[PDB]
Structures are given as C-alpha cells and as structure tokens.
C-alpha cells in the first residue's frame, strides 16, 4: 500500500500473512507453514527523466515458537532509472535467468524449484549489479534486455574468503556474468537468458558431485497472458549449476516447467503445472536421475485484491530409490491449504 | 496508528517502545529489560457482510548488544468474518483458554504467568484454527463462543516430526481441541473455557514429570469492568499442562489469579493482584508444591493514549526450598520501572 | 518520512537501502556489504510544554544468504521532554561521549571507529538513563548539557550476571556515569565530554590486556558548520576503555579525529579525514602501538534528499607488524562504493 507520496518521493509499504498448512506423508513436509512477508518500494523523482529507487523485502516465519524465530531478506537494492535509456541497480536482487523462468513460477504454493535461492544467477542472490534496457531506448515497445554481474560471494574462512562469506558451499559463487532478452506483444511472450558463473574453490574441493570450473545456464521461454488465460513454459539446460539434494550439483541438467491457468470472472483460478529436472551423467555411480519431477494441480480463489485462499496439490512423480534417499530428495505428495491477507 | 484506509482496505501499523528496568536480588531478573513491539492489523471489505483480515505482531528486544539481538513473532494469522455468522482465522494466534484468562492478565509488567507461550492451547502458539461466533448470530448481545483446533507442532528430528518441528519439548504439542464461552453485560463478565491437547512422544519419553496421554485445562472466570473500576478473577485446573520450571509438567495444578484496579480521572491507575499455581501430586518426591505464588502491587500513570510510565512490585511469596531450586523457579522479589511510548 | 500526524501524535517511519561494495586486499574486507536500516520516531503532545517520545532503529544486513541473515537494534528508547527544563529518556541509546565525538563521525562510509558499539559510554549501548538540558533552561541559546547513567550490563552466566547478560566481555559494562557540555553559535561548535564506567569482573579476569577497576574517557571537540563548509575535530584520551583488536583494551589511549568537507551547490560533497588511535603502555610486550591510523578521502553526490551515491577511500597508514597481526587489526586499504535510497 502507498502510505506516503509527497514532494517528489513515494513509498509503498506492502506485505502479507499466509496462514498455511502442509499435508504430507513426509513428516518433514507436514504441518504448519504459516509465514509473512514485509517490504517497501521507495521511489524519488530527481528530474523529469531520472528517478532513484530502493526496494527491500523480508520473510518472517509464523510457524515457529518464540524461542527461535527465523527470518531473512529476500531482496535489498538501490538504483537509478533514466527514461528511454535504462536502469542500474545493485544489491541482493533476482538473477537475470529469472527474467524468463519467473514466467512459470506462478503456482499457488509450489513450483519454481528447478533452482534455488543463492544458487548462482538463477534466482535471488547477493551482490547483483544489473543494467536493464526497457523497450530498446523507447524505439521497440516490448523488447527488453539486461546485462548482469554478480560479484564473488565466497567462504567465511580461509582461502576464497569474502567479507560476506558463507560456509555453505551451495550458497557461494565466484564472479558471474549473465544476460537476458525478452519480447512481449499483445499477451504473447518470448524470451532467452544465459548465465555464466565461476565456481569457488570450496565448492570444487569438498567431495561433492558436479564440480567444475564454471556454472552455466541456458534458458528459453514462451508465454501467453491475455483474455483470462495464462500459459507459460521454460526450458533451462544447466552445467554445474543445478543442486542435487545433498550430493552436490548436476554435471548436466535439463529443466522444464509448463503451466496452464484460467481466471474465472467470479474469482476462481485453477492451475495445472508440470515441473521436471533431469540429471545427466551425475557421476558417483548415478548416471541419469530425475532430480525433480511432479505434476501440480491447484486453485486460488480471489475474494479481492487484498484477500484470497488456495489449495495446491503436488503430485510427486519421483520414485523412492537409492538416488533420492542418498540425495535426501522428497518423493512424497504435498497438499497445501492457505489463507492469505495482503496489502 | 491507522496509516492507510482506501478503496475498501485499511491498515493499522502499531507498536511501542518500553524503556524498562528490573531490580531484583536474583541476578537473572536484574537489569535492563528494554524492548519494543511492532505490528500491523489489516482489514479488507470484500462485501457488505464479508471482511478479510490479517494480523502480525513482533517483539524485538532492546536490552541486548548488536552482536546478538533476539526477536520473535507473537501472532501471525489471516481470516474471514461474516456479519451475524462468525469468523474463521488460522496461524500463530492465542489459544481459546486465553479468552477467559486474559481477564486477569492486565498488570503493569508482571502477571499472566500461571501458563506460558507455546504451552498447549493456553496462550500464544502455532497453527491454531479458530472458529468464533459473536453475539450468538446477532441474537444475544454479549454471548460469545469459540471452537479451536491446534495441529501437531512436533519435534525437529526423528519420530513425531513436523515441518515446523522444535526440539524443546515444552514448546511441542499434539492435536488439540478447545472451546470457550463468555457473557458480558453492562460491565459484568463471566466465562468458561476448556482445552484438550494430545501430548507428543518426546514430552512423555524424556524423563520429565507430568507425563501422560493428554494435556487438559478447565477454566472459569469472572470480571467487572465499568465506572473506572476493574475487578477480575480466573481459576484454571490443569492436567499435564502447567510447566513446573525445568522439572517437567504438573500432573495436576490449580491456578488462581485475582486483580483489583481503579482508574483515577487525572490518569493514575493503581493495581493489586494475587497470582498462585499449586502443583498437586507432582511426583519426584515433592508431592504438593507451589509452582508460583506472589502478590503484585503497582501503578501506571497515563500521560495520554500514546504515553505512560509505571512501577510494578512483584512481592514473591514462594519459599526458597529444594523444589524451587531444582525447578529453577525464581522466589525473589522484582520491582519493574518502565517508560512507554506507543502508537 | 512522516506517515502519521493526528490528534496530538506524529510518527516518522524512516529507513534506507545502501547498495554497498568494498574493494580491499584484505579478503575479510572485500565484497558485497549491502544493508538496510529501518526505524520510527514517534512523538506525542501531552500538554503545551510536555511531550512524550519513542525511537527505534534497526539494521538488517543485505549481503547474506537467506539461511542465515543478521540484524540488530541500534537504538530503542522512550522519554519525556519539558519545554525550558529538559528531557529524560531510557533504553538502548547513544552514550554522552558521542555528543562530541559524533562531530567527526560524518564520513561517507568509514570513520567513527576509534571506539565501538557497546563499548562503555562511548557509543550505542544498553540501559542508558539520560538527562538533557537544552539551551540552559531557555536562558542561553546554544548551551547544552547532559548527565547520563548506564546500568551494569553483565555476563550471561555465573558471577556478575544480569538478566540481559552477555558472554562477550568487550560488550559488558559495570555501572557508569557520564556528562557532556556543548556550545554552538552561528556555525561554530565547541564541546567537552567525560565518562567513568566500572569494569565488570569477567573483563578483568579473562587474561586480556587493559584490565583495571574503571573505564574512563575524556573528550574535547571543535567544529564549524556553516556556508557549505564542514570542519570538525575531536580528541579523546581513554583509560581501559579503547578496544585493541582481540588483545583486550588499551591501558591508555590517545584518539584523534579530524575532518574537512565542502558542499557544492550542484550536489557534490568531497571529504578529507584523518583518524588515529595511539595505544600507550599496552603491556604484553607491546608498549606503544597505533591501534588505528588512516587517512580517508572520499565524495558523496546527492541527487536529492532521498538519493545519493558515494566513493570512500580508506588509505590505511598502519604497518603490518607483530602487534597488528596478533590483535587482528586490518592494515589494508578499503575503497567503498555505495548507492543509497532513503526516506
Ligand atoms: C547494457 C549495459 C552494458 C553494461 C556496461 C557496464 C560496464 C561497467 S561500468 O558501468 C563501470 C565502469 O567501471
Ligand atoms: C457448526 C460447526 C461447528 C464447528 C466444527 C468445525 C469442524 C471443522 S471442519 O469444517 C474442517 C474439516 O473438513
Ligand atoms: C539537576 C539535575 C540533576 C540530574 C541528575 C538526576 C539525579 C538522579 S535521580 O533523579 C534518580 C534517583 O531516584
């Protein structure tokens, strides 16, 4: 909600409370999942064509006792935007791969998990410097592109250390570069993205699988968003980038996400999605294994812009086998039931 | 404070800073206790008779250094309210036992501690699904009732695990059911509450006292709230529900709280309260011991709705003995001195 | 930003996002340093001459992954202000030594580090009770003084324990008393401050250097703040108060900070500063060592009140030697590059 707008600056304070419950045969995926998000979007008019902005978003879990409550920053960045030239922002933000893969990340509860947070330039992560050009200098409405640099987020000790270092190797990265191009026209969307990150010393020298010099993602995507119908698909082919449970990363992975949705006038929105991640030549005796594979059927009912409720059913297609147990990958179904207020 | 109210949605952002200091012979209860609370109450008009709402409240301690600052969510829930039918909400919220025991939880600093947070359905806890009926379908002004379900909040590992699991057994619970009825009329209040929770495997198989299949509370309460006078009393009889320091829980407990207050026109509000918790047949050689017992004398001076200061004197009536030392229960006096800004 | 002002109470919700990056040969000082701050300033008119107030400020780091995000309260206090008499506030707040040393704490990124947080009464710390007199009862415009008491912030276990205890001895303190006087007139500022804190048992009995009965600071300061020119200097002489890396504290220390700045009309603000901390008779074989010593050259460009960017270059003058390695003191340069949105 816009709670301030005065003398050239405005501030949107926004958030939500999701009363959320998971039902699953997997005990680790069963029970209260209530949480909230809080954020602000600030924007200031410097001149006719130049605006400064800042954004911050924070998740606070609501399913924990008061002795040990968990929370974190999703994004936190500042930037500058010049009309018919472009923008620059820096901070914790989304990787440019997500400019395309976000198109399928629209399920009621699940989805968007053929990749993780702090997972190279694929989703949210630290220290992105992002240059964006919107509508090609105002000459081609709908044509957007971005170039993105991610600085090294290293270890918390020893060699390859950064000031914001982290001992979990799955959350580290070296210097990376990425780009995205997208074109939207009368509801039809088409986009490509590419990212290339250096892998740090710790992630290649701790005995995990999917070691190598660089992490790489190549993404293509298509969507249709008009007349109350939402169709989208994305295919990403990764190298040393996709996480495989606890085992490490996938030498090669082929990720595919597809979604179909329809918005009824009275507020009902049914959703059918298919997500899949295929590990190829994973090593460690596993050759070719499904890292992820499930069908998602669900529905959100929008009371209005400020309130909704939804059910989401993750029909898990993975087999319980040696690879999934070793990696610690869930192969059980999850049904999500949620009640959501937002402002 | 209402910082937003527009096109059918309003948002109250509220909070306070309590500059607070404790004086006690017990070193663990002596010193700076400064803290703040922050929250929002959001509410949206869906129709003439249907409203959606969300609430979130957060405590941030202000008495710690910057290397290690502690904070937690008190409540976080969403819900729906239909006029002359009732409400439903879900999330971290207060247990329905508190619909009655809150009546004595009105002291300046102390009080309200014959029970804890995350202590079955007695106070704040995770995953409450709460149905409420207000004024009996609009036919009996003052008559309220509630039915409440709390889902299992289990361990963080092994058997009886939940996704929001917790290794502290005092903060766990199994499935529980509770109800409350209250009637208020021209300042006079009368109420009863009942709760029945299943106890998890860990809380019955870790060597503690007060083990058993279910936790149970039966509460009665009376109050008078009119003509600047506040009188209230509550009596709760619990089984395997009341915490006894570190020892475990009380097989049986008899809890009683009584308060008397008077609001002077110029802003002074003196308070006299008596709290007591009697453990019966506690085992471990005890067998009948006071778990809690103190008289509280205090006063709050309200400068206005936004500012006040208070002194609160917990005259501790417990004897320093084997049970209290073993349980780790404070038997020393505490004087609280506080300065409070709120909005 | 003032987001509420109604019926005698107003509330300023403020904050910023600093997209920040450090470049240094020291790996521990190199990389993403993005962070945000959030706070509110509340103030209520009780009468014509009496106002109640509350303030709270919070830092949330933006350079960490979502599994482990760090945050803390900077200040949290309530108080009362009577016109032409003075104010009283209590809580986590700034020590009165800072009434003078803040004058040099105005660099774009660095500076203000001849002392720490939770470092006796020198900067931010817990449990300050602060009495302030502004303009000497309204009889001498510009003449301010303060008396301040800090209650014991002790250990988290054993002897010398407080309820808000802390096991890091560098963040503990005993009872302390401090005072400040300042005089400002047509841009010219002059001030003195004195503080005297008791050192706790743990800080004198854990093998560190700079042990002794009391911590003491004596501070003098001068400044000029007018006609777009900012000049300021502070000299503090401390005893058992200044931190020396991990080694302990400095028996005696001589701290000096000097700054020169100029505000161009078009928004550029160049800054040149010199900071220095000289340890005297440190013991442990060290004798006389520079604890801190660097020159700071930098510049902030203000787009407007809500947006800016800056570069800050810490030219480190310390030699890499036995003392600096043992203490773990950085002797490498740091260049800071920041983009900042604030409201
Ligand atoms: C789409 C914009 C192309 C990226 C160019 C950025 C070059 C880095 S520059 O902005 C910093 C100068 O050191
Ligand atoms: C008039 C009904 C009394 C309240 C009982 C609530 C039952 C919960 S049920 O509707 C959810 C399980 O499907
Ligand atoms: C002349 C003003 C003196 C300021 C110091 C106040 C003394 C502390 S006292 O008021 C609290 C002990 O009860």
Residue numbers in the entry:
A (entry chain B), B (entry chain C), C (entry chain A): 1 to 343
Study text:
The overall sequence of the OmpC protein from the first isolate (OmpC20) is quite different from that found in the lab strain E. coli K12 and it is thought that the infecting organisms evolved from the uropathogenic E. coli strain O6, which expresses a related OmpC protein. The overall structure is very close to that reported for the OmpC K12 structure, with an alignment of 0.44 Å r.m.s.d. for 340 Cα atoms. The sequence of the L3 constriction loop is highly conserved in all OmpC homologs, with the only difference being G116 of OmpC K12 being substituted for an aspartic acid (D116) in OmpC20. The conformation of L3 is virtually identical in both proteins. Examination of the electrostatic surface calculated using CCP4MG shows that OmpC20 has a more negatively charged entrance than either OmpC K12 or the presumed parent OmpC O6. The narrowest point at the constriction zone, as defined by HOLE, has a radius of 2.9 Å in all structures. Examining the pathway of the imaginary sphere used by HOLE to measure radius, reveals that the largest differences between OmpC20 (and 26, 28, 33) and OmpC K12 (and OmpCO6) occur in extracellular cavity above the constriction zone where the channel radius is narrowed by over 1 Å in OmpC20 (and 26, 38, 33), due to changes in L3 and L4. The calculations show a lower barrier for transit through OmpC20 than in OmpC33. During translocation through OmpC20, cefotaxime penetrates with the aminothiazoly group down (the θ coordinate in Fig. 5a assumes values near 180°), interacting with an arginine cluster at the constriction zone.
Porins, which are beta-barrel proteins that traverse the bacterial outer membrane, facilitate the uptake of small polar nutrients and are the main entry pathway for many antibiotics. The crystal structures of OmpF and OmpC show that they are both built of 16 amphipathic β-strands arranged into a barrel with a central pore. At the eyelet, there is a strong transverse electric field due to the presence of conserved basic amino acid residues on the barrel wall facing acidic residues on L3.
